Design a binder for this molecule. Sequence first.
Ligand SMILES: CC(=O)c1ccc[n+]([C@@H]2O[C@H](COP(=O)([O-])OP(=O)(O)OC[C@H]3O[C@@H](n4cnc5c(N)ncnc54)[C@H](O)[C@@H]3O)[C@@H](O)[C@H]2O)c1
Ligand SMILES: CC(=O)c1ccc[n+]([C@@H]2O[C@H](COP(=O)([O-])OP(=O)(O)OC[C@H]3O[C@@H](n4cnc5c(N)ncnc54)[C@H](O)[C@@H]3O)[C@@H](O)[C@H]2O)c1
Ligand SMILES: CC(=O)c1ccc[n+]([C@@H]2O[C@H](COP(=O)([O-])OP(=O)(O)OC[C@H]3O[C@@H](n4cnc5c(N)ncnc54)[C@H](O)[C@@H]3O)[C@@H](O)[C@H]2O)c1
Ligand SMILES: CC(=O)c1ccc[n+]([C@@H]2O[C@H](COP(=O)([O-])OP(=O)(O)OC[C@H]3O[C@@H](n4cnc5c(N)ncnc54)[C@H](O)[C@@H]3O)[C@@H](O)[C@H]2O)c1
Lengths: 328, 325, 328, 326
Amino acid sequence: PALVQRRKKVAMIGSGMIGGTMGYLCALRELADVVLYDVVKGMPEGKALDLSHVTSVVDTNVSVRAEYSYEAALTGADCVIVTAGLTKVPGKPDSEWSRNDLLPFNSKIIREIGQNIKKYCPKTFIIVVTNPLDCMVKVMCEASGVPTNMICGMACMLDSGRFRRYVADALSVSPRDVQATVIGTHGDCMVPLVRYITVNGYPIQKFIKDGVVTEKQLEEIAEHTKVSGGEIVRFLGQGSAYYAPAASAVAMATSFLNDEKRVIPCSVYCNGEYGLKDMFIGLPAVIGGAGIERVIELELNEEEKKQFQKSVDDVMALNKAVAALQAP
Amino acid sequence: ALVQRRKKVAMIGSGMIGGTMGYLCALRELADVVLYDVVKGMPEGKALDLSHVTSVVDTNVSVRAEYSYEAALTGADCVIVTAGLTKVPGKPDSEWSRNDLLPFNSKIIREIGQNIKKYCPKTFIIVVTNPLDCMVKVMCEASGVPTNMICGMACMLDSGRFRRYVADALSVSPRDVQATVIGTHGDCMVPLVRYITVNGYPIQKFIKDGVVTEKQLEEIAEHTKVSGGEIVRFLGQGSAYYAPAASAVAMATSFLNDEKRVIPCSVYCNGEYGLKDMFIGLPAVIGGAGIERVIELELNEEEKKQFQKSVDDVMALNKAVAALQ
Amino acid sequence: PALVQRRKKVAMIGSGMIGGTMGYLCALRELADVVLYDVVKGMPEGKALDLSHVTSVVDTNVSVRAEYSYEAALTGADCVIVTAGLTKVPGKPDSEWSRNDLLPFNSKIIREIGQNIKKYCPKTFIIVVTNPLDCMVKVMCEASGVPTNMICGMACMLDSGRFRRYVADALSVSPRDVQATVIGTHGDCMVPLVRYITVNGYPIQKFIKDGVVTEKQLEEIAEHTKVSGGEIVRFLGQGSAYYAPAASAVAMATSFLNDEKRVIPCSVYCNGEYGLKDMFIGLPAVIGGAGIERVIELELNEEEKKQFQKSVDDVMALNKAVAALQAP
Amino acid sequence: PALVQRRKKVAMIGSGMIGGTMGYLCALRELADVVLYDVVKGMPEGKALDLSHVTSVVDTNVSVRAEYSYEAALTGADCVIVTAGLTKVPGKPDSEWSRNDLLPFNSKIIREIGQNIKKYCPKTFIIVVTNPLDCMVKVMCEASGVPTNMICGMACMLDSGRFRRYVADALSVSPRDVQATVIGTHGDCMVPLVRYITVNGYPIQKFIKDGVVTEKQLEEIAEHTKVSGGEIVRFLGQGSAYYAPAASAVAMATSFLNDEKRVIPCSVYCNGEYGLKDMFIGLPAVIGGAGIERVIELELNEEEKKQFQKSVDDVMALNKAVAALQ
Ligand SMILES: CC(=O)c1ccc[n+]([C@@H]2O[C@H](COP(=O)([O-])OP(=O)(O)OC[C@H]3O[C@@H](n4cnc5c(N)ncnc54)[C@H](O)[C@@H]3O)[C@@H](O)[C@H]2O)c1
Ligand SMILES: CC(=O)c1ccc[n+]([C@@H]2O[C@H](COP(=O)([O-])OP(=O)(O)OC[C@H]3O[C@@H](n4cnc5c(N)ncnc54)[C@H](O)[C@@H]3O)[C@@H](O)[C@H]2O)c1
Ligand SMILES: CC(=O)c1ccc[n+]([C@@H]2O[C@H](COP(=O)([O-])OP(=O)(O)OC[C@H]3O[C@@H](n4cnc5c(N)ncnc54)[C@H](O)[C@@H]3O)[C@@H](O)[C@H]2O)c1
Ligand SMILES: CC(=O)c1ccc[n+]([C@@H]2O[C@H](COP(=O)([O-])OP(=O)(O)OC[C@H]3O[C@@H](n4cnc5c(N)ncnc54)[C@H](O)[C@@H]3O)[C@@H](O)[C@H]2O)c1
């Protein structure tokens, strides 16, 4: 008979570590049918077969397929999660790893994908993952032409996730009950908001006063959060983090697909908030069935504003450079 | 030959909340379940129905009714007690009061505690029976368990109500609303409006941004305080059970899986706020060692006043029980 | 901004034990927004409040609301699960409890609800629970006017669930790995297919030959399955089973909402199966996004056909009676 | 306060593709604390950090740690899942990929791990994944000395999963409702039991008669199942399957840890089934809190017996080869 309830469809544009991992979460949770697309042929088909086998093992039913063209991959996608691009610059020491160095390699890839989203699924919700994140979300926004509430970048949920894990270990509590947020650009200028940390809404200052943790410990945790990505790159040897990045992107996609209205910090379009316009930066936001439904403006004190401003400068300079170098 | 044994949770009281908690256990494959009650037949009916659920949802736990304390309690990793009454016989809904349940619920709780002492002294006890904070103390005295191994479920429910109302007002998921109620479960409970956060962000900025008003938050705190009576009035008979059951099982799961969740509940006071030898609702950390932390938040003038009234109420009920026996 | 992904909506018409329990599963699983409707004033509002509180406790976000008009309850419903009606005949001994006795009390209620579905949500998937089940599904089909693939009755998943639990206990295996099915009408004439029992696809006959279970043990399990409903009625004293019935109806609703294509025996429309036409009866079926997508016809031996024919004769007689007494 | 309820602990010995993936499942489901161990330094610490970050993201609380010594990785492990070893033979064309050729490189690795399990966690439940599977489980068995019911190898749940997925696609039903089993030795000689395929317990034969699937189609599906591992190796270019293998191993571990008593085909110790003794081969088994609680012997028809004997010959030759090596 005629299909009345159609499964959601999520397209993974980029089927490397993060793309395959997100496909895994979808199959494991029966969240949506999955399409894997990559410029590398053969590999997506292998992962799609492996992921299709997972559905039997875990008793779920979603279709996982590799698609070779942008048209087949993007058509009908409720959400498109983009991880296409490079993770490290070839021929460079891990000690010198920088997300900003990826700019010249990844801007063109992200722009091309955006042009195809405009053509095949202009109504989709786009979640960008490719680094340098905040810069790439802007490139994607310009190329895809989608409404600004229908595009965001995954980064701060991961940075906040790291921040929360470290605080949870220091306090001996579940990270479910630590609210710690990182805002700003995803990189060395990110801003872990130590002053705002709460444990089930209780101020972290209470735990400092009680003698469970010290300010020094918290600042060390904030620094650890900032260098966590590079730490994993150095330990892995090849590639970068993927389990938590994938879980973060899918958590965001799920808040959209199920209209959950979760409050998740992510790279979002600024139209005045914090005084910024025509750019994307990591800020707390509400993700629901209408995409980015609210961008939360936090009051920042002198030091916080100074840190955030540096973040703002990094991304504004990079965005200008990208605009300057863009092929007509 | 058995190396890994399933956890076992004993529901002492198999009425609305007891059966509902058994359902959560069967749905999540959390633990084997025993349903115990003084009413004959009913627990066997619910145990059968719940055993059928395991097939429907593809899980495998044992759900059985037991009519003896020895069979119900032996081997229990956690005992959740709901045995007792929900309303005073021959009393109007507009006169419903949790404190009026102190009469014989007190003897019921004492008997159960004596049996836990005998059959599963190493268990973690979660009391639900009203008047909650008062009954937890009776249970602690009768059972003899370490003070970190007993608590009462109340504030997670009150906090859940508080959170749902704030979430609706802000249009966000309640997962991201941290709102807490402390004190004694009743008209004197204390909703901590000052401590409401949205994913850790102070509610104060949402007020300034015009998302919610101060009057609206006050109304939400008041609604939280009377939510139980509201449900009692609407149901006509009995009281809430879905959220109370989910709260008790969330607490049991944090213990069984050593999660270390921060959950407000009725806990033993070892000097906090100058309180000793009593239980009252406070934020706590529940892990594999039971209650592992009790948080003593800084209260503002209004909260101190309200909390003192909560304390007066508890100490008076405890005084009353000491009068009975 | 404009809503793009709307949550599914399930209307519980009848907010008694089963209706409230199904609302609970929806809130626990973030499956759908829920509406509780009943002719009893007040009670649905109390349950809706309780269930809304559950969403905070378990960290989900769905709307649970009570509605007192058919229009508010049914409009926009992706799936309608109907439990409205009596469970026992007033003043009759539990020893004489019979689902068929409920016929004159529940037929008018089911017809009225169907007439409202026809007006308010003609594209919904209807799952009837009200007894006597197979007769009520037919009344609902005629009254609602929905396509025959968009209506079914929940019974055999429950009967089979019971059958499976008893066999799983006998073999000391998880019921996940016991496939046991009951077909026919939900009542004393239901047919537990002992011959078809499998353990992860392996025939039960091998477990008999190897001494794990006996023929009598299996016959007693089938008998226990048939009398399970009444056994619970007698133990409870008031009302009938609700936890497993609720889980079964929601499992069926989920297979439709998520287009899972699970194989679940349920009361479905017959268009030739066993020479049966214009009636509903419990049979294995595939439930997907297009509703009942396939009705499975099993080969029955002499004894099975005899038992099934008895089921058929009972429901056909009752369906004729109901039609003869229907208000003009 | 003294700890009363301790989380389960699962040790992943081998932190490559499958080991890290299994750690992911544990973190996502809050199944157990996880230890990642590997001979490669650095990488396990990187994966452990990444996985610890996942717990915050998905609101769970388990500890994920890398450990570089056997003592630290194995002590207190309720279950040990072993993937340590090689996936492909260096300098060997993918067109020539063979699990059997991995024997000389992995036999010593597995024996060493087994000796360490004996020393540090003799009461653990061992799940072996390293290829050639049935052969490696026997090596693990001899080296660890654990009770015969506390060791098994993961392979047939994965092969059956593939089998089930293809049948589910052909029938347009959820694979939850397809019961299809592969028994024997994990390799080109595995035995997909077509005759034992059921759809929620209903014989596949009726679906053939109803015209939903043909007999030829079912045979093609059995063939596809046999060559699925190599099909993925071919497409991937480097490495082999890991998502479904990881999910299968963890499903087995979960059936043990929560005493679920699921019926899962896996490589188990034979006490006379099919006249097989002192060896492991893939057979339907019940996995519960007492480990392998039952091994199911199915009646085989002529064709199935012929195919199964080839499976038996395959593993017996491998075990003979190992006895000759070490
Ligand atoms: C923002 C944040 O928190 C975060 C975290 C981790 C990684 N990342 C970035 O996410 C991206 C992917 O990481 P990964 O998955 O580990 O990397 P990796 O495993 O290398 O996969 C990237 C994949 O994209 C493919 N690809 C390259 N060019 C194209 C193209 N033009 N079109 C389609 N596919 C293409 C490539 O073949 C490869 O399979 C990188 O840019 C990372 O730096 C961001
Ligand atoms: C603290 C909090 O938030 C909260 C919320 C909701 C209900 N409660 C209380 O929880 C309790 C149970 O509520 P309910 O389940 O809805 O009530 P209900 O459905 O009446 O069940 C209580 C059950 O306990 C049984 N019982 C009575 N005496 C004994 C005894 N000596 N031993 C064993 N069982 C006995 C009784 O037969 C009945 O089945 C009541 O005291 C409620 O007031 C507390
Ligand atoms: C088929 C099967 O397996 C199965 C299993 C269990 C129960 N049932 C039946 O399911 C039905 C519901 O059982 P229950 O929930 O336990 O019963 P119960 O708790 O009594 O609730 C039925 C509800 O329907 C309400 N109701 C009555 N008339 C109307 C009306 N005109 N419009 C709207 N609501 C109305 C009534 O007020 C009550 O709240 C009964 O008919 C049972 O026999 C079937
Ligand atoms: C039975 C079955 O169905 C199945 C399916 C897929 C893979 N496998 C096998 O499973 C194994 C793991 O596959 P993978 O994870 O993809 O491979 P891979 O990613 O290469 O990881 C194997 C890991 O083991 C490590 N290792 C090597 N020697 C030792 C040692 N002595 N001690 C500790 N660690 C060591 C190695 O450094 C690497 O990190 C291989 O043997 C595969 O052939 C079996």
